[PDB]
Amino acid sequence: SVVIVGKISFCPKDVLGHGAEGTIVYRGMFDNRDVAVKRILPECFSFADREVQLLRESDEHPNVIRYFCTEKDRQFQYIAIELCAATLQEYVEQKDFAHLGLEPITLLQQTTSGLAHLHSLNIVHRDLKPHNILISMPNAHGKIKAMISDFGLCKKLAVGRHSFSRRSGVPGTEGWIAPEMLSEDCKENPTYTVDIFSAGCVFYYVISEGSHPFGKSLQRQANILLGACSLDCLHPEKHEDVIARELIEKMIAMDPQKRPSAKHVLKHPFFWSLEKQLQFFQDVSDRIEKESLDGPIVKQLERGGRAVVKMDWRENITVPLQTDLTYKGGSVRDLLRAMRNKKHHYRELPAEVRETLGSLPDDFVCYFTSRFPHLLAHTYRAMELCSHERLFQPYYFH
Amino acid sequence: SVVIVGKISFCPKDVLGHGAEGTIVYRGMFDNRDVAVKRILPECFSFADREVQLLRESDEHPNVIRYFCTEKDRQFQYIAIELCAATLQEYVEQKDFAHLGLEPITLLQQTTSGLAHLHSLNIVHRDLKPHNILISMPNAHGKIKAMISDFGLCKKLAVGRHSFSRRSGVPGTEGWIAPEMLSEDCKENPTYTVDIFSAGCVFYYVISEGSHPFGKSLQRQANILLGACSLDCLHPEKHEDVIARELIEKMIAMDPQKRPSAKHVLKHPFFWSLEKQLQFFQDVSDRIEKESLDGPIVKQLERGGRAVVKMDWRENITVPLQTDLTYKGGSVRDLLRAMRNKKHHYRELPAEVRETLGSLPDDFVCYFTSRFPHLLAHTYRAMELCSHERLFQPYYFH
């Protein structure tokens, strides 16, 4: 039996999910389109009217769920939206990541894009979690994407307003709520960074493949208020986990002013390709070639640098490279200068030294980041002194 | 009096345009959304059903017009689509381009993106013209975009099929039809490149601010069959017009096999920023630094190079630069090598030589392209020998 309510037509046997306030999501059709149909009770005709309104004006972004139509009835209201393959929670729980490549990070970047779009419209989502981050059906080329959904808790801030009050509405979903939303003694109103806190937990939830920065369910919201978090799944001497830790640590910071904006997150090396990482290394190496060794930029770069280059980086690179090399082995700047030269003079390098480096640019940059897993993170943090310069606009945001 | 036909609700006093087969476009509403409403006669219930179907499956791209809904009536069918500010024709005719910057080129790039999206779905538009290229309403940040519309003439090719037949359907709109659609003696079926031909004319129509490669209305379709075209608005010694001419000439080529694909067009330096143009010059200069002077790549680059560098490029650059310079003045390769050095050693350059060059990277690259308006086009054509190499993937397509 296929219920029809105007242009929306769904079958009640095809249930897809349920939500708070006893709303049920069914599969259906709208205009020869396969859609997901939300059924709304008369006790949420405002929860729906606010969600549909904000969805109508932010669904322009490809990483915001596409809204089609709402048909009101005699006892109900219905919401037609884009039909998705799964939620992000079901994705992490049921997919083998060994066969997915960089896709989990792409979903995180797409989620951040849609979040930055909402923030650019003065809209704070306030309830970001894996459950309401949806995975699209594969398109004609077999590609999928993530999309923000569930706009029932989100607020539009007035133009000019930086923040909003705690007292209005439920604080969110337990276990993903920024601590400033619940802490008893909070002298500062919540702002757009509550979404960055939730996003930070989602980031760890995806790359840890199911864990939470603040522990298991029963504790995590109380750990959030205590600030008791741990990122154990990130190995401290693996280049990728070091990069992710640097980002995630800032996103879930207790101080909301320390959390990056969504536009800062989109610029973080957590999303850079190997090619872009090698370009960053070449860009700062060119930038500091004629910079004084006791100037501000070189000082910051060498600050704590001996641990980065592992006392003597000349003793930590393969023998074929050790040969053809004046370089201070404790200098981060001199390690980058070696990489700048080996990349530039790569075509003219001996075969066995091009061999151990690998192919430009992917294997070449992995040669160094795998041996010095803190080099990129340390350099990215130090070279923030030039984030305003035109040359580094690809790498920072301002 | 506001007519209501279900979810679609428009007012007949708010007419926006008319179309062939006596269809009229009105302003209206669909779901608290401002939309444009097409009214369809019973003699186009197939012209509509095919357009709505192809629009339903390609409106995912931001540069394809967004389709909302169709309500059928007792004597009519109605099409709800995104409400646009103007057509591209009205844009070229009524806007002062001095106050628009690079926007007309952005509209051309967005139009090409949406066209490449259609071609990637095996859909040939077959009727691309300024009239049915729509300009969006400005978004929340005041930005506009172009969108393809009018899918009534477009065909979905079966998977595998390279072409389609002339005999089916009207050939298009007179004055924008590829010559293979009308020429009496044509031994080769039309293919996706009919859209590239139309797009090429649209390109000239926008940058010439109203002219056509094939002359005025009464002649142009007959000039198309004769191949009698002229691009008079493109000055032969201005860097931008030389780049545009190189692209437009290939897009409107009589041989359809010589017309670039939409993905090739998107890669052409016609769309490169000044920064990207300077990066191309640096990339080929690095690429050919240790290449033999009598090797294939350097031979192609110097082929016809004396006219590019104007006999002696050392006599065509300002005096402050002439000083601090071993360089063969008839060599395109040596002109690029000079630019590679002045960019690399820019911070360490004398003040008056940094002055005449200008700021990196915009004024620096314009210093050379303005003095040698064929340098980029000639180098781009010659360096196609490396289009397959990873380093040049930003600049070509393959």
Residue numbers in the entry:
A (entry chain A), B (entry chain A): 562 to 886, 891 to 963
Question: What does the paper behind this entry write?
Answer:
In IRE1 apo structures and IRE1 in complex with allosteric activators, D620 and E621 of one monomer form salt bridges with R627 and K706, respectively, of the second monomer, while in the AMG-18 structure D620 has flipped outward due to the helix unwinding, hindering hydrogen bond formation with K706 and interacting instead with the backbone of A701.
The lumenal domain senses unfolded proteins in the ER through indirect and direct mechanisms: as a result, it undergoes dimerization and subsequent oligomerization. The association of the lumenal domain promotes dimerization and oligomerization of the cytoplasmic kinase-RNase tandem domain. The cytoplasmic domain has been shown to self-associate via different surface contacts, where a back-to-back (B2B) configuration is believed to fulfill the essential structural requirements for RNase activation.
